[PDB]
Design a protein around this ligand. Structure first.
Ligand SMILES: CCCCCCCCCCCCCCCCCC(=O)OC[C@H](CO[C@@H]1O[C@H](CO[C@H]2O[C@H](CO)[C@H](O)[C@H](O)[C@H]2O)[C@H](O)[C@H](O)[C@H]1O)OC(=O)CCCCCCCCCCCCCCCCC
Ligand code: CLA
Ligand code: CLA
Ligand code: CLA
Ligand code: CLA
Ligand SMILES: C=Cc1c(C)c2cc3nc(c4c5[nH]c(cc6nc(cc1[nH]2)C(C)=C6CC)c(C)c5C(=O)[C@@H]4C(=O)OC)[C@@H](CCC(=O)OC/C=C(\C)CCC[C@H](C)CCC[C@H](C)CCCC(C)C)[C@@H]3C
Ligand code: KC2
Ligand code: KC2
Ligand SMILES: CC1=C(C#C/C(C)=C/C=C/C(C)=C/C=C/C=C(C)/C=C/C=C(C)/C=C/C2=C(C)CCCC2(C)C)C(C)(C)C[C@H](O)C1
Ligand SMILES: CC1=C(C#C/C(C)=C/C=C/C(C)=C/C=C/C=C(C)/C=C/C=C(C)/C=C/C2=C(C)CCCC2(C)C)C(C)(C)C[C@H](O)C1
Ligand SMILES: CC1=CCCC(C)(C)[C@H]1/C=C/C(C)=C/C=C/C(C)=C/C=C/C=C(C)/C=C/C=C(C)/C=C/C1=C(C)CCCC1(C)C
Ligand SMILES: [Fe+2]
Lengths: 190, 341, 37, 36, 32, 173, 64, 26, 65, 38
């Protein structure tokens, strides 16, 4: 729920083109932003599942890039050289670290992602993006859980754009996010 | 409906230009092939592959501008822009003749897409697909001449370059090095093409000169309307005319139109067989009996022997500049001549 | 065994016969010089 | 591993993301939008 | 309107056409 | 969504609690595509082979007979391939599997529980509760050994060291 | 129609003109200028000899 | 493990398109 | 129609004429396998075409010995 | 001088299709005459 404001019906990002017909206040983060006609033709369960997956992966990726520029784990030295963003991908798939990661995420996607999304598309009670993962009691109260869902959606939406910016700035300069913050002028191309 | 059904509905919509599923292959490949040919004939040189200037930027006109074949140093390489020859460098890719490979490959796929387009439009309209079977003639011509012949030869260098004067060179080069006029399959191809032109002209004249007087105007083009249940010309009068003028005449319109279809297609396929034979230098170049007769009799001469001498002269006097990679250096003494004979 | 329902008569027109004879004779004339070499 | 195979893999990725994915996405979007 | 198959195909066959026409017109006035 | 082991994936349609070890873990579609009796028979056979294999991997390294040379287990497979003892073991395993085929045919027909060969010489698992506890222990040990034998073999292939030889002096890759 | 194309078409024509007049076509497509067909050291026709060293060979040939 | 297309697919339409005759043709 | 021992032995193999799976069946699997086959064909084509060098692979007669 | 095989090829490749076509035409005319009044 999380109020009738900032995610519900009656809150429009535009002055209002009568709102998309398939978008209402039932779904989380629905400020009625849909300039294209994606909503009606696309399944909203699949679309919300894809949005949540992209947001979670983007949050992890942005935090990983920031920490990797900030701090290397013990023993990551003697290896990889500099390896900020993309040389890191190539050298690590050469070594086998990203091969191990791809194998285990393949296991996770085969055993959790595919069956959960298939059952959700068939009408299961599971909401999109929900995997029942709560080892700590962070979502016992639904009053806080709705706010947590809205925060998760907004931070994932921010993190998609953030990680895209990090990738494109590295593609232009060869410099990661923290180092990009450190030196502002463009002409330095490491 | 599903996503596939909706995409099929959209691609099949009656627009000004039909797209269809085959369009997804035809339009990009054909557009890229045509644009690459224009780019090559406008900007790209042949100086590092053939030692020739073929572009408007270098001063060539429409006849002398061409997209020349790759260098003979390249074998039968695909010459991908990212391939080991170019390694992503657009300038070096254009200089080594990679634009010719681009045009040839995307044009072959465009021909495949156009054949599929003919099939798809025939299926949707609800008619027999005798188009895309007629187009198999041009498809076989392109495959045999621009693909199979260089693949049988040393490299893409000996394929025809995409230009007017380049095509004329290719004609004379093949005549000199293969005696392709003497090839019986080429003779059948010439017969097919000339007979198809004859059939087109004679059928047009016969229909125009046997029309029924269906109008009061002297100009008779207005007398026809597409929604006609009656034939616009007299088949009986035409049959009588050609049976008492030529001795034989068509009596079945369907057989006549199938014959007008069959003659150019058969000619093109026979010529394609001949060019495939040329691809491995398996040519009907010479008659052994005539050569033996001329060797043991200096006073024996026929037009075939004169053609052999002409082909030898063509080869000797065009080898140095037509194949600069071979570094042919022929002294004037060894160059054949009529006085030298 | 038994009567086969797929049996169909085969017909060749006089026009088809003459087309075939002309094609065979013309191909023979064309390829005789090359076969004799 | 050779530069040629890296170029081949990058060519597959470029053909997917510059030719196949954009054209397919545009076709799907227009087909779904225009149900007629 | 803004995007149509006819519109996109036309401008695909027009924007290079005008560019090449300008290039060839410039080629006509080269010192050669 | 009541799979009882993966909370968001729901109980599979034919994965009722009739079978021992049924915690509802079947994310991919395999019990809906194949007979559950055949699947349980294959699971028990794989697990029993794996348990015997793990015990053999320990014992052969710890002690090898007065006869046969001192070898690693994979080198032992190769040597007994070329010697003839492996042929004998394959012959006798195939001889037992010849009647295992008939047992599986019965299981297809019925009148036989999957994996039940009525093999119990020492008279263990008296009363039904002990039998159910032993069934649960057997299935858990079977799956654990199925993972463990592959672990042993791949670790030997990578590090060129046997399992207890690798436990001390780890020599990380 | 005419309002947008009375700006877009002449600008595009001028851009096409400048693509040749400024010499960018020669640099992009590698077409030799009329004064650089034969170098002082190489007075012969430059031809690629090896397919796998074609880029380096062209760099050597076009360096001067 | 634990529908027929019912279409001939070998059928020519084989329907003769009859054409009428007028007084001029007669 | 003659009945034979071999005919009745092989009869179930020629019994389900026209039997089809429901809508689209296993088409995505077929498309994925066709895509893999196309990638494999491209790899082997570029290998002999010499446009692709992997390692220790010498497309040449001299590689025979 | 000229090979035996060359004459054999020319004569046989002329005659065999010719006799095939003649046989087919005669068979068709025989069917037409038998079906029609004679
Ligand atoms: C109608 C339907 C089709 C519709 C049109 C379709 C158009 C799209 C496809 C067109 C292009 C296809 C790819 C052609 C690339 C090629 O051919 O690439 C050619 C390569 C072989 O490359 C050549 O190989 C030759 C032999 O080399 C070998 O021998 C040499 C001896 O000195 C050396 O030892 C050398 O190291 C060793 O590799 C030479 O080296 C040549 O220089 C070199 O170019 O084959 C290969 O990639 C693969 C070879 C397997 C056969 C696949 C193609 C078959 C087509 C006929 C091929 C010609 C046969 C005669 C036709 C008449
Ligand atoms: C999209 C997610 C993503 C991806 C693909 C990678 C991939 C990589 N990371 Mg990064 N990383 C991530 C997220 C990610 N990381 C996050 C979220 C953090 C913060 C904890 C880090 C912190 C981090 C450090 C400090 C270092 C790497 C390093 C590496 C490389 C070696 C793998 C490794 O040791 O990881 C180690 C990463 C972890 C153990 C964190 C994973 C735990 C998160 C919370 C996922 C758990 C999911 C469930 C809750 C590899 C390129 C190393 C490297 O090569 O740097 C040059 C390195 O030194 N990562
Ligand atoms: C229990 C399951 C399991 C097992 C047996 C392995 C086994 C291995 N992993 Mg993997 N891994 C796993 C789970 C597992 N992984 C999970 C859940 C993750 C997080 C998604 C990873 C992420 C991961 C990365 C990022 C890397 C490995 C690496 C390795 C190798 C370590 C080599 C060594 O000397 O180890 C000694 C280990 C210790 C002393 C501790 C080895 C093949 C590394 C590799 O590829 O080696 C080159 C490597 O870089 N693993
Ligand atoms: C109908 C569309 C179509 C088709 C059939 C082709 C076909 C071709 N192109 Mg063309 N091309 C196209 C569109 C198309 N192109 C467009 C839109 C562009 C503009 C970006 C280009 C630009 C272009 C250039 C610049 C070049 C080609 C070349 C080629 C040839 C080599 C293809 C190759 O190996 O790439 C490899 C990549 C693929 C085949 C992509 C396949 C992706 C797979 C199927 C998806 C799966 C990926 C996998 C999971 C990831 C691993 C081939 C004849 C080259 C050539 O031969 O020129 C001489 C060349 O240099 N094309
Ligand atoms: C009663 C049945 C029977 C018989 C006659 C044999 C006979 C044989 N076995 Mg086999 N074997 C059997 C049952 C049997 N086996 C069973 C049930 C198993 C367990 C699955 C094996 C496992 C086995 C292995 C692993 C090996 C043999 C070997 C042998 C040979 C050893 C003969 C020798 O040197 O003297 C043996 C003398 C004594 C034991 C002293 C008393 C011989 C051909 C060996 C072989 O092939 O050698 C070439 C070998 O390595 N057998
Ligand atoms: C040199 C002669 C010649 C040309 C130029 C030609 C051209 C054409 N005929 C077509 C059709 C046909 N041709 C037919 C019968 C024949 N056509 C013949 C001979 C020719 N046909 C002959 C001899 C026959 C008798 C069998 C039929 C039955 C059809 C059709 O149905 C079709 C049509 O509708 O026409 C009315 C069109 C095919 C369009 C296409 O593929 O999609 C777009 C174009 C593509 C994909 C080609 C681009 C790639 C090409 C191959 C390489 C690039 C070439 C450069 C752009 C230009 C190079 C120029 C230099 C060589 C000088 C095109 C206008
Ligand atoms: C769980 C936290 C953790 C992570 C996420 C992680 C990831 C990686 C990756 C990325 C995939 C590589 C490539 C890598 C490689 C090495 N690690 Mg490892 N490593 C971690 C933990 C430790 C500890 C505690 C130590 C250690 C070591 C080494 C040595 C040293 C040998 C050498 O001298 O060559 C090498 C080469 C030692 C060391 O030097 O650390 C000061 C040691 O004490 N690591 N490590
Ligand atoms: C759609 C892709 C994309 C996304 C989603 C995205 C998001 C963000 C965010 C997140 C909201 C921030 C905070 C951010 C910040 C900066 N971006 Mg940026 N960005 C994207 C693309 C590009 C390109 C193409 C360039 C660029 C630049 C800069 C500079 C200049 C510093 C400088 O002048 O040195 C700064 C501070 C330029 C640069 O990288 O210079 C080489 C440059 O051309 N970005 N960017
Ligand atoms: C590992 C690997 C690599 C890699 C890689 C990776 C991770 C690539 C990832 C790239 C990503 C995530 C790009 C996305 C950037 C964000 C965009 C374009 C959206 C901007 C928002 C817009 C435009 C508008 C937003 C908005 C809306 C909608 C409209 C209204 C307002 C507003 C709010 C502004 C390689 C490929 C480099 C190769 C290497 O060998 C290996
Ligand atoms: C070929 C060869 C031979 C051989 C051989 C042999 C025997 C080869 C056999 C190899 C085997 C059995 C490999 C096993 C792999 C099992 C895996 C990766 C599963 C792990 C469990 C997981 C991931 C659990 C995940 C999970 C966990 C708890 C949490 C999440 C949920 C869940 C999914 C349940 C020889 C030796 C005879 C020699 C001859 O010369 C050649
Ligand atoms: C006067 C005259 C007399 C007779 C009648 C007449 C003929 C009608 C008239 C002529 C008039 C005239 C002169 C008409 C001429 C009109 C002209 C010159 C049209 C040029 C069009 C250029 C195109 C389509 C290039 C597109 C480039 C592409 C696709 C790039 C491709 C790329 C390449 C290189 C390969 C890499 C990848 C990419 C990036 C894809
Ligand atoms: Fe007509």
């Amino acid at each position: 729920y999380q109020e009738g404001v900032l995610q519900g019906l009656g809150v429009d990002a535009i002055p209002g083109t009568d709102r998309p017909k398939n978008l209402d206040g039932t779904l989380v983060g629905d400020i009625g932003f849909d300039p294209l006609g994606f909503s009606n033709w696309l399944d909203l369960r699949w679309a919300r599942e894809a949005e949540i997956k992209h947001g979670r992966v983007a949050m992890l990726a942005a935090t990983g890039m920031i920490v990797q520029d900030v701090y290397k784990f013990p023993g990551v030295q003697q290896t990889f050289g500099d390896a900020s963003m993309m040389k890191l991908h190539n050298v690590a798939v050469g070594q086998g670290a990203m091969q191990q990661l791809f194998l285990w995420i393949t296991v996770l996607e085969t055993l959790t992602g595919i069956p959960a999304i298939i059952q959700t598309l068939k009408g299961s009670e599971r909401q999109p993006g929900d995997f029942g993962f709560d080892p700590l009691g962070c979502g016992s109260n639904p009053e806080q859980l709705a706010r947590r869902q809205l925060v998760e959606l907004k931070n994932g939406r921010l993190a998609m754009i953030a990680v895209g910016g990090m990738v494109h700035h590295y593609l232009l300069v060869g410099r990661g996010p923290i180092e990009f913050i450190k030196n502002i002028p463009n002409f330095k191309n490491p | 409906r599903g996503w596939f059904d909706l995409m099929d509905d959209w691609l099949k919509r009656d627009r000004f230009v039909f797209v269809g599923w085959s369009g997804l292959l035809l339009f990009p490949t054909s557009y890229l092939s045509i644009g690459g040919w224009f780019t090559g004939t406008t900007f790209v040189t042949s100086w590092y592959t053939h030692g020739l200037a073929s572009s408007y930027l270098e001063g060539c006109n429409f006849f002398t501008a061409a997209v020349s074949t790759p260098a003979n140093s390249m074998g039968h390489s695909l010459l991908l822009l990212w391939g080991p020859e170019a390694q992503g460098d657009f300038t070096r890719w254009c200089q080594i003749g990679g634009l010719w490979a681009f045009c040839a490959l995307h044009g072959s796929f465009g021909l495949i897409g156009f054949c599929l387009r003919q099939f798809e439009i025939a299926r949707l309209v609800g008619i027999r697909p005798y188009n895309a079977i007629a187009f198999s003639g041009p498809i076989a011509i392109f495959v045999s001449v621009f693909l199979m012949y260089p693949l049988g030869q040393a490299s893409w260098f000996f394929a025809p370059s995409l230009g007017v004067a380049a095509i004329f060179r290719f004609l004379l080069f093949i005549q000199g090095f293969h005696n392709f006029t003497l090839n019986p399959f080429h003779m059948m191809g010439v017969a097919g093409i000339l007979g198809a032109a004859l059939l087109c002209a004679i059928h047009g004249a016969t229909v125009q000169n046997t029309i029924f007087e269906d109008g009061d105007a002297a100009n008779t083009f207005r007398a026809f309307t597409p929604t006609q249940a009656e034939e616009t010309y007299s088949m009986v009068t035409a049959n009588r005319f050609w049976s008492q003028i030529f001795g034989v005449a068509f009596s079945n319109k369907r057989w006549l139109h199938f014959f007008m279809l069959f003659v150019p297609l058969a000619g093109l396929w026979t010529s394609a067989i001949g060019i495939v034979g040329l691809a491995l230098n398996l040519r009907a170049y010479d008659f052994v009996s005539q050569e033996l007769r001329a060797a043991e009799d200096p006073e024996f001469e026929t037009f075939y022997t004169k053609n052999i001498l002409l082909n030898e002269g063509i080869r000797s006097w065009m080898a140095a500049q037509d194949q600069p990679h071979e570094n042919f250096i022929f002294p004037e003494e060894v160059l054949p001549r009529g006085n030298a004979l | 065994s038994g009567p086969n329902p797929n049996k169909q008569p085969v017909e060749l027109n006089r026009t088809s016969l003459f087309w075939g004879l002309l094609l065979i004779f013309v191909l023979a004339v064309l390829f005789s010089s090359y076969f004799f070499n | 591993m050779t530069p040629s195979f890296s170029a081949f893999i990058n060519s597959l990725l470029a053909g997917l993301f510059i030719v196949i994915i954009p054209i397919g996405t545009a076709l799907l979007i227009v087909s779904q939008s225009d149900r007629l | 309107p803004i995007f149509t198959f006819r519109w996109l195909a036309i401008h695909g066959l027009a924007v290079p056409t005008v560019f090449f026409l300008g290039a060839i017109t410039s080629m006509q006035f080269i010192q050669r | 969504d009541f799979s009882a082991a993966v909370p968001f994936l729901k109980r599979p349609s034919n994965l009722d609690g009739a079978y021992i070890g049924d915690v509802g873990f079947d994310p991919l579609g395999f019990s809906d595509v194949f007979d559950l009796r055949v699947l349980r028979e294959a699971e028990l056979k794989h697990g029993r082979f794996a348990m015997l294999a793990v015990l053999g991997f320990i014992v052969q390294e710890l002690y090898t007979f007065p006869f046969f040379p001192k070898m690693a287990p994979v080198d032992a497979h190769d040597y007994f391939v070329k010697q003839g003892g492996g042929s004998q073991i394959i012959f006798w395993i195939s001889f037992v599997e010849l009647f295992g085929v008939v047992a599986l045919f019965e299981t297809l027909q019925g009148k036989r529980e999957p994996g039940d060969f009525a093999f119990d010489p020492l008279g263990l698992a008296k009363d039904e509760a002990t039998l159910e506890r032993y069934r649960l222990a057997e299935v858990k040990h079977a799956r654990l050994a199925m993972i463990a034998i592959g672990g042993f073999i791949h670790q030997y292939w990578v590090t060129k060291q046997t399992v207890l030889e690798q436990l001390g002096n780890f020599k990380s890759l | 129609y005419w309002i947008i194309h009375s700006i877009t078409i002449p600008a595009l024509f001028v851009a096409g003109w400048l693509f040749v007049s400024t010499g960018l076509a020669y640099d992009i497509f590698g077409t030799p200028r009329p004064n650089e067909y034969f170098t002082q050291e190489r007075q012969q026709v430059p031809l690629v000899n090896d397919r796998f060293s074609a880029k380096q060979e062209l760099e050597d040939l076009t360096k001067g | 493990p634990r529908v027929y297309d019912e279409e001939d697919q070998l059928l020519i339409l084989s329907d003769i398109v009859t054409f009428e005759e007028t007084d001029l043709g007669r | 129609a003659l009945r034979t021992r071999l005919g009745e032995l092989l009869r179930p193999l020629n019994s389900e004429y026209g039997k089809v799976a429901p809508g689209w069946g296993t088409t995505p699997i077929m498309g994925f396998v066709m895509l893999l086959f196309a990638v494999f064909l491209l790899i082997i084509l570029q290998i002999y075409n010499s446009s692709l060098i992997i390692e220790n692979v010498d497309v040449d007669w001299a590689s025979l010995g | 001088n000229v090979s035996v095989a060359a004459y054999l090829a020319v004569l046989l490749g002329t005659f065999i299709p010719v006799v095939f076509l003649i046989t087919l035409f005669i068979q068709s005319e025989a069917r037409k005459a038998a079906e029609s009044g004679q």
